[PDB]
Amino acid sequence: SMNPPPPETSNPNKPKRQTNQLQYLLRVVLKTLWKHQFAWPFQQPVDAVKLNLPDYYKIIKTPMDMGTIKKRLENNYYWNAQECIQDFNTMFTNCYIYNKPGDDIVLMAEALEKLFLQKINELPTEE
Ligand SMILES: Cc1cnc(Nc2ccc(OCCN3CCCC3)cc2)nc1Nc1cccc(S(=O)(=O)NC(C)(C)C)c1
């Protein structure tokens, strides 16, 4: 089978705002995770065709990845910081769901999640 279309990253019908928290999510959180040595499996939608994973999109029905999150942030797609944090959580939980405890890919996600949570603990109060 084909891959699904990627998640939406722009919708001109959606209102936009910039907030200090969304700025921090792009400029600090996403920038820090992106450069991590384990970030590469998470930087774009899973290409189940190229990776030969016929069951991936049978199991993962709410796909998410950092490439999508980056594009959402750069497009001002998100209104609330919590939408973006939810997308990161979806990405990490999808990894845990598809794979098994102690798999290398799971240890990679665990390391990125720990860093994510450290950076979110420093999320500035909304202004
Ligand atoms: C976000 C994500 C979540 N879970 C997975 N799990 C996963 C994906 C592919 C897997 O394929 C096993 C056999 N292939 C591994 C490389 C040779 C053939 C096994 C597990 N991959 C993910 N992303 C991913 C992205 C690019 C490449 C790869 S990979 O195919 O190189 N698989 C890993 C070695 C990283 C597990 C995986």
Side-chain angles (χ1 to χ4, degrees), residues 1-17 19-125 127:
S1 33
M2 304 158 81
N3 290 313
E8 190 173 62
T9 54
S10 172
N11 182 341
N13 292 334
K14 295 182 76 185
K16 304 170 157 48
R17 71 179 178 172
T19 69
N20 61 324
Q21 292 185 330
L22 287 160
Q23 287 169 337
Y24 173 90
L25 282 161
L26 181 58
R27 296 183 182 284
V28 178
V29 179
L30 180 68
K31 169 183 250 186
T32 297
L33 296 202
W34 195 273
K35 73 183 203 225
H36 195 280
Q37 71 170 297
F38 293 160
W40 61 273
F42 305 99
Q43 284 173 343
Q44 58 288 307
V46 171
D47 183 336
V49 175
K50 214 165 106 299
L51 301 180
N52 195 19
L53 305 177
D55 63 337
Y56 187 82
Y57 292 109
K58 303 188 188 291
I59 293 159
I60 298 305
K61 304 300 195 183
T62 302
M64 190 48 59
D65 63 279
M66 294 203 296
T68 298
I69 294 167
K70 178 160 208 319
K71 288 169 180 186
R72 286 181 170 195
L73 282 162
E74 297 278 7
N75 272 293
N76 299 300
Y77 181 87
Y78 299 122
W79 184 265
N80 286 336
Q82 163 193 81
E83 298 173 271
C84 178
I85 291 162
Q86 176 59 251
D87 282 350
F88 276 103
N89 288 150
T90 294
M91 183 184 78
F92 294 125
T93 61
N94 285 345
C95 184
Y96 307 144
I97 288 161
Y98 184 69
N99 306 278
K100 298 304 194 302
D103 285 346
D104 285 343
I105 187 68
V106 168
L107 303 173
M108 297 170 75
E110 285 174 358
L112 295 169
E113 183 181 33
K114 179 174 173 164
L115 180 58
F116 172 73
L117 291 171
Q118 291 173 338
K119 298 303 186 186
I120 294 305
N121 282 340
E122 296 150 10
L123 187 73
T125 313
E127 272 146 31

